[PDB]
Amino acid sequence: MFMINVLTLIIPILLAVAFLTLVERKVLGYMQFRKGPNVVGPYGLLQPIADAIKLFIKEPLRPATSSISMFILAPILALTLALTMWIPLPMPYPLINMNLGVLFMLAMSSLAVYSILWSGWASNSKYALIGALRAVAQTISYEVTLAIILLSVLLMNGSFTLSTLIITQEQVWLIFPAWPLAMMWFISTLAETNRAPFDLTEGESELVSGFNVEYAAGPFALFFMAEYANIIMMNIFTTTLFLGAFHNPYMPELYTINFTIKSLLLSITFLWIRASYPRFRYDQLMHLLWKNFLPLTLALCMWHVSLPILLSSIPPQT
Amino acid sequence: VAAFLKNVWAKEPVLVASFAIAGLAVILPTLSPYTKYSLMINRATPYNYPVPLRDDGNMPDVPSHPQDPQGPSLEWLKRL
Amino acid sequence: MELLQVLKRGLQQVSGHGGLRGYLRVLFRANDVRVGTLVGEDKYGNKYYEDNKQFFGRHRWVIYTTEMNGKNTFWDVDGSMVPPEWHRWLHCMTDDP
Amino acid sequence: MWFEVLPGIAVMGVCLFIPGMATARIHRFSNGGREKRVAHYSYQWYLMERDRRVSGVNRYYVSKGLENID
Amino acid sequence: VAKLDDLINWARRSSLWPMTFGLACCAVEMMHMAAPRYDMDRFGVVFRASPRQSDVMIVAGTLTNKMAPALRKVYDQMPEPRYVVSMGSCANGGGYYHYSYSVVRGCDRIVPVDIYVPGCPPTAEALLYGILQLQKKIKREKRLRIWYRR
Amino acid sequence: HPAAHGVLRLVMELSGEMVRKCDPHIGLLHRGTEKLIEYKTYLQALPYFDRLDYVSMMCNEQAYSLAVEKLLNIQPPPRAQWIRVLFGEITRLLNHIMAVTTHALDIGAMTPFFWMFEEREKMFEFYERVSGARMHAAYVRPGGVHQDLPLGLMDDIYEFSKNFSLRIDELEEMLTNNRIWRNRTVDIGVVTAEDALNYGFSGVMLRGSGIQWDLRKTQPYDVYDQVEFDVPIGSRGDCYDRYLCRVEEMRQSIRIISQCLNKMPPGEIKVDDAKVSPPKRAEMKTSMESLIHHFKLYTEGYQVPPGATYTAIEAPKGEFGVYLVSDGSSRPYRCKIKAPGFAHLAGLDKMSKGHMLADVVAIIGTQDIVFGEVDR
Amino acid sequence: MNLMITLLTNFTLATLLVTIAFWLPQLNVYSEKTSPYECGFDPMGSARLPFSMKFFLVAITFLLFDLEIALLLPLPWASQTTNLNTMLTMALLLIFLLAVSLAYEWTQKGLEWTE
Amino acid sequence: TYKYVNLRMKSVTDRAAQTLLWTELIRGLGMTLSYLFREPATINYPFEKGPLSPRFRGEHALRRYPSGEERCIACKLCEAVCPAQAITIEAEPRADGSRRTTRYDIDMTKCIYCGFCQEACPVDAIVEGPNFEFSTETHEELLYNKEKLLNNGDKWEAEIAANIQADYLYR
Numbered sequence A: 001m002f003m004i005n006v007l008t009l010i011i012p013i014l015l016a017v018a019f020l021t022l023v024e025r026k027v028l029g030y031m032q033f034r035k036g037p038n039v040v041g042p043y044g045l046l047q048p049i050a051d052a053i054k055l056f057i058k059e060p061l062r063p064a065t066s067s068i069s070m071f072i073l074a075p076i077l078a079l080t081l082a083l084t085m086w087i088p089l090p091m092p093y094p095l096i097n098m099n100l101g102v103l104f105m106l107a108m109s110s111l112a113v114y115s116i117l118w119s120g121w122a123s124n125s126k127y128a129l130i131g132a133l134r135a136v137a138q139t140i141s142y143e144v145t146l147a148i149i150l151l152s153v154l155l156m157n158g159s160f161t162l163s164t165l166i167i168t169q170e171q172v173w174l175i176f177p178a179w180p181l182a183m184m185w186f187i188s189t190l191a192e193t194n195r196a197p198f199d200l201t202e203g204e205s206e207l208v209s210g211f212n213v214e215y216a217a218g219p220f221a222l223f224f225m226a227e228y229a230n231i232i233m234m235n236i237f238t239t240t241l242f243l244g245a246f247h248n249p250y251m252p253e254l255y256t257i258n259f260t261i262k263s264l265l266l267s268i269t270f271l272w273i274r275a276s277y278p279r280f281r282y283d284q285l286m287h288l289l290w291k292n293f294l295p296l297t298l299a300l301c302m303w304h305v306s307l308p309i310l311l312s313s314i315p316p317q318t
Numbered sequence B: 001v002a003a004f005l006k007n008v009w010a011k012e013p014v015l016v017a018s019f020a021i022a023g024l025a026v027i028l029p030t031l032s033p034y035t036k037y038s039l040m041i042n043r044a045t046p047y048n049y050p051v052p053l054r055d056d057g058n059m060p061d062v063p064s065h066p067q068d069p070q071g072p073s074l075e076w077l078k079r080l
Numbered sequence C: 001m002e003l004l005q006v007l008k009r010g011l012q013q014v015s016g017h018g019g020l021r022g023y024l025r026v027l028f029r030a031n032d033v034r035v036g037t038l039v040g041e042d043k044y045g046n047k048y049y050e051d052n053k054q055f056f057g058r059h060r061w062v063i064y065t066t067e068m069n070g071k072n073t074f075w076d077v078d079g080s081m082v083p084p085e086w087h088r089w090l091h092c093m094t095d096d097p
Numbered sequence D: 001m002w003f004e005v006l007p008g009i010a011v012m013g014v015c016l017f018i019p020g021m022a023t024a025r026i027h028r029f030s031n032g033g034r035e036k037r038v039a040h041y042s043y044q045w046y047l048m049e050r051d052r053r054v055s056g057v058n059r060y061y062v063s064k065g066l067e068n069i070d
Numbered sequence E: 001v002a003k004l005d006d007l008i009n010w011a012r013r014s015s016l017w018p019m020t021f022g023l024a025c026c027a028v029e030m031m032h033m034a035a036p037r038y039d040m041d042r043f044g045v046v047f048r049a050s051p052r053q054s055d056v057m058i059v060a061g062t063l064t065n066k067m068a069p070a071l072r073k074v075y076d077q078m079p080e081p082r083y084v085v086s087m088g089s090c091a092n093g094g095g096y097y098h099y100s101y102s103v104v105r106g107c108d109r110i111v112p113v114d115i116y117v118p119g120c121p122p123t124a125e126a127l128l129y130g131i132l133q134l135q136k137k138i139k140r141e142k143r144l145r146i147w148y149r150r
Numbered sequence F: 001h002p003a004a005h006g007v008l009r010l011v012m013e014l015s016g017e018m019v020r021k022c023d024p025h026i027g028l029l030h031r032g033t034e035k036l037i038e039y040k041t042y043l044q045a046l047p048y049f050d051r052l053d054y055v056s057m058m059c060n061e062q063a064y065s066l067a068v069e070k071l072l073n074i075q076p077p078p079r080a081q082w083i084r085v086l087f088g089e090i091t092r093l094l095n096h097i098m099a100v101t102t103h104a105l106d107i108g109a110m111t112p113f114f115w116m117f118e119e120r121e122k123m124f125e126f127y128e129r130v131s132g133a134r135m136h137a138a139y140v141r142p143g144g145v146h147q148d149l150p151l152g153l154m155d156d157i158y159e160f161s162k163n164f165s166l167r168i169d170e171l172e173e174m175l176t177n178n179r180i181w182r183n184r185t186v187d188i189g190v191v192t193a194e195d196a197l198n199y200g201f202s203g204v205m206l207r208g209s210g211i212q213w214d215l216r217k218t219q220p221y222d223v224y225d226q227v228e229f230d231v232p233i234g235s236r237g238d239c240y241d242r243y244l245c246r247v248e249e250m251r252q253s254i255r256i257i258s259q260c261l262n263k264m265p266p267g268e269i270k271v272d273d274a275k276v277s278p279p280k281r282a283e284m285k286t287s288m289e290s291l292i293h294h295f296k297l298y299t300e301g302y303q304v305p306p307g308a309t310y311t312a313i314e315a316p317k318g319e320f321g322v323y324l325v326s327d328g329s330s331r332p333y334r335c336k337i338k339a340p341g342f343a344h345l346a347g348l349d350k351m352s353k354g355h356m357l358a359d360v361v362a363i364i365g366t367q368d369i370v371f372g373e374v375d376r
Numbered sequence G: 001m002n003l004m005i006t007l008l009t010n011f012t013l014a015t016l017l018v019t020i021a022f023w024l025p026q027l028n029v030y031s032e033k034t035s036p037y038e039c040g041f042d043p044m045g046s047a048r049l050p051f052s053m054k055f056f057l058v059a060i061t062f063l064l065f066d067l068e069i070a071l072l073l074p075l076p077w078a079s080q081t082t083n084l085n086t087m088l089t090m091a092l093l094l095i096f097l098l099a100v101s102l103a104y105e106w107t108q109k110g111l112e113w114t115e
Numbered sequence H: 001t002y003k004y005v006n007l008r009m010k011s012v013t014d015r016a017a018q019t020l021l022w023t024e025l026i027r028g029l030g031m032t033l034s035y036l037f038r039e040p041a042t043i044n045y046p047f048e049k050g051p052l053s054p055r056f057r058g059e060h061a062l063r064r065y066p067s068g069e070e071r072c073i074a075c076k077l078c079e080a081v082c083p084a085q086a087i088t089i090e091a092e093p094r095a096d097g098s099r100r101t102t103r104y105d106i107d108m109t110k111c112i113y114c115g116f117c118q119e120a121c122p123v124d125a126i127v128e129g130p131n132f133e134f135s136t137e138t139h140e141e142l143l144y145n146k147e148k149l150l151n152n153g154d155k156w157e158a159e160i161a162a163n164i165q166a167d168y169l170y171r
């Protein structure tokens, strides 16, 4: 009966992506002193359905100069990669109980850029090439910091399993002994998912649309849902990493309620962040992450290496 | 050295903070009192099987029962 | 506790629109559920309301009819169904209805 | 006013509640009322295979107690 | 096929995506329409800069002789279905600069225009009325019924 | 392109991604106003000036009216002068709101655009109440203004000017102290005073470079010498100093608006010489001379003595001038429009040397450029 | 096995959407909708010209720092080792080598940009 | 007369704490959240309309006397003052000898809506009326003849007369 579990994992996150678009437009209007979409349905509840049907009855409009192989291969790979790393998340019991789920998340997150590169190179245009180059620079910036953030936060967990991450929260949150690393991790999740002020690929003022500027409707919606599943899942991962809740084996309802509310609040905070700051230049992206973030996280990494030896607090690996 | 420290704290505080954390992480475990406690905590974890030994009749330390007072105890971690 | 007053205002907005049927009708048609002082009505069926407690621009509004000049206007409400006297009143050109 | 976003976002809450809960409920069906036996190393797998080999129905979740022996 | 026609007409008319094609005074009037006072985004109308992901195009300003190939290429790169909304008087019939040597006398000569919005500049409420008229024009489309009859 | 102002063709030689040669190809909005002007009389050529700079409409009207009144050797009544100065300051606030908010949108902060476009709509409503059109008023005419202010408008102006400084403070908190906004404009687009004057720059650019020059303080017009206000002066030539200068110019515009509202004198709104200004509709239908003058003014147009003049006003973008040459007939012989945007886009090549492409779009944003004015 | 089933189901759902997006609606193509997008004008040359990219050393040293990460990554299980002094000393040594490489990059003008 | 914009351990520690803990970013976020909790200024179009003025320049109309007889007397001042040359007038005396018009065409795609004709008319015949919601679908529908202008005048007389009564003393 794993098929039913897989379907119930993969369909409601797509529905969550659609209603994330709804509340995205609503809240993003609301801090701009205007209302959101509320004409189509009662408080605009039918906006995602109209958006989804509208993109799928348009014309795909494949370009002549585009190499059709990677042009048709990039969005499906993007949607699959945004979908395939949801499994090791404990919810409170994960789909697949992998001992090294952090490594799986890291490797499938490294794979997620390849759809952007193949969509940039497959379409023959200068804007797609510039978007691919900026995505490459964004990956250069964020990977070498994000790996060390995850390792140094994970050093008190004792193992790479995400199931044992819920055990460590039973006394106190790990955001209290690792609040600077929490700031580093939040900026890194801002940078990875390509959300403002770290967008730099789907630019409106710099480029037209960047990596998918030649992508018409149908294939374009896959990148949209992939990015929104990415941000929802990344906020769920941050919630599990730093603000893990109280788990009771006899009632999973408590933990589902708690992490759902916490991840929803973190996504609202992400929406709050994404439209209050100017967009960064991509030359200042590695003038910050390679210059200010890296020495600080090296110092904190060696501090978290030498800290359980200091206090005699070596965590168990099991 | 105060003027130079004030200058680097005014220009880039991140480097000063990083070097302070690095120096603390270098010099504090060499002054820690619980490092040997970590040593015995790691050494006392029973990973593999504690196989017994043959008897020639002359051993004052090893016991014949796990509950015998002879042999090493683990009271220090129980109290801590 | 002021939140109980907000819930009271919500239930009075539910009750004052003729009930749940009128509440759902105005919700699906006008996308608004505010009650107001009925200024009047015209010969076609356009009911013109006002409420001076709202801010400027939202202090005068109109609920359109359901059948004007033969067409079904339950969903295809147009901005040019206002007679000239009510056109003068509605766009805030004078204070005299 | 502002609280009008509070309906729609609530729907997203349901969209963040239906998956994970379902997995837990699925874990309360295929495992005979208990949780799924989390296997992480070779000895946990050996114990689970021991339950599978002793249950006689080729199901590990059918746990037999001290009443099985005489 | 009558009800399926009613569905896809509702999906296209409630998620119109215009493109950022302004040229003159009338572009500033469009930006004034997109202000919180009138709030285009409440109608399912969100600005998208790329022609490949846009539904309609509102030509705001004066279309000169140096601009006709650009407008023609931008219109030709939009995916079907596409609608063009003329705006102001410059894009309607030339308007003030109708007799000039370097102004196209109405943008109908370059692109097929669906909705004519008159003004100089037209008021943002009138522009919202024109967009609602375009939505009502989309609503009464009869694609699948005509396909079934043919 | 959203960062482009609708009509622009920047061809750049990207050396990887930095610019070595940038060339603005323009003329996509060349309507040819200066040929259509000479085929129309002065009253008919007045609304042509509303559409050159379509964020600074009343200032262009004031420049054209000042040129025609200097040629006609007539001056408006003082109430008309105070009305012109008040609506020119409202126009300056309009232009500065549009320029700052569009620059912040082109850099990436998209909230103050929606925050102050409702205030821009409020001033559009003020234009609606005073002239009858939301944007193209055609209100300032040679001889003063066209109509008197309606009853109850000035209380609305006072209330809006009272409540607008909080919005200015909100914007200045949201952008000035932001580190991301700062780091885009620390040392970008630096210009020197010698290259400011030699490249024909006027207005904020000069005040960005420390040059102390303002046409409202050195060569004043109608009542600007009777109003006390400050002039911001930059110190580095970057875009940051120009943005700060624009914000301070908004604050001084509020100050001038308060001084205007506390000092409006009673009187008439047109020049009482009926051979230039049209007569009132009450006395047109009773007096024969007024009917004859109305007929010939709205059919032929008042004659202007022959000669050439070049007047210049302090437009919100800089110095807006017109070279008007009249041959004695009711139509101008040659009307040339000098604009700050032409020289600013000419100096864009020098100001953008050695920067990344995002800094080029920042330099494009930091020049308040309206391309209808640039292409005329 | 379950990972393979999840991968196959995800790929099936992904590739079913594009097929629905392609073969369901009516296609109508000419030789202008397939043209490359250059803001309404013809493209100047092709996009296959070599970019004069300026962060080549940053990409190579990203690779090298990722291999530093690969050396530093099995550190948590080393927390269960007996010889703790050598563990701590050499984890500090490897982090110090990473910092030495970064500091040499900082001093010798490597983190900046060309031209 | 002039001012200098941008000419300005505890302070260094405060700046470093602002760098590390993001004080002014929190301030800007607080102002964003302040604007989240206010009442949005979106008016419910088309059930609500924006404020206007009695001087509003909208749709062209031809008025009439309060006896049924039309107001235009074929004086051709509107087509002589029109800056866009959008007005075409052809006139002849009708059967009773009254100087009237036979053709009065306004090209509304040429008209710039500047109200010179509504102020140059000696008998207040042509009026830039108040209607702004008159968008069409075809280009020829925006090309009014005399019959359409007379129909617009008879349609909107009931508010055009009131607007003229309210505004005529400022002229």
Ligand SMILES: CCCCCCCCCCCCCCCCCC(=O)OC[C@H](COP(=O)([O-])OCC[N+](C)(C)C)OC(=O)CCCCCCCCCCCCCCCCC
Binding pocket: A180, A182, A183, A185, A186, A187, A238, A242, A269, A273, A277, A288, A292, A293, A296, B011, B012, B013, B014, B017, B020, B021, B024, F179, H019, H020, H021, H022, H025
């Ligand atoms: C995950 C939980 C929630 C997290 C918070 C989420 C809500 C708040 C989000 C705020 C907005 C974030 C996005 C916008 C900003 C993006 C840019 C950015 O972050 O730039 C980073 C900025 C960039 O700095 P900058 O932009 O000022 O750079 C200027 C640099 N100089 C001065 C050289 C010219 O800061 C850093 O890079 C610093 C890294 C974080 C520092 C954390 C310090 C923790 C404490 C250390 C010890 C302190 C005590 C002293 C030593 C004691 C030793 C024993």
Ligand code: SF4
Binding pocket: E024, E025, E026, E060, E061, E062, E087, E088, E089, E090, E091, E095, E096, E119, E120, E121, E122, F051
């Ligand atoms: S129609 Fe009028 S407002 Fe619009 S661009 Fe032309 S002159 Fe400007």
Ligand code: SF4
Binding pocket: H078, H081, H082, H083, H084, H085, H086, H087, H106, H110, H111, H112, H113, H114, H115, H116, H117, H118, H128
């Ligand atoms: S409003 Fe102006 S442009 Fe229009 S018809 Fe009258 S005079 Fe001509």
Ligand code: SF4
Binding pocket: H071, H072, H073, H074, H075, H076, H077, H078, H079, H089, H120, H121, H122, H123, H124, H125, H126
């Ligand atoms: S100005 Fe008036 S009376 Fe004269 S021709 Fe025109 S509409 Fe007729």
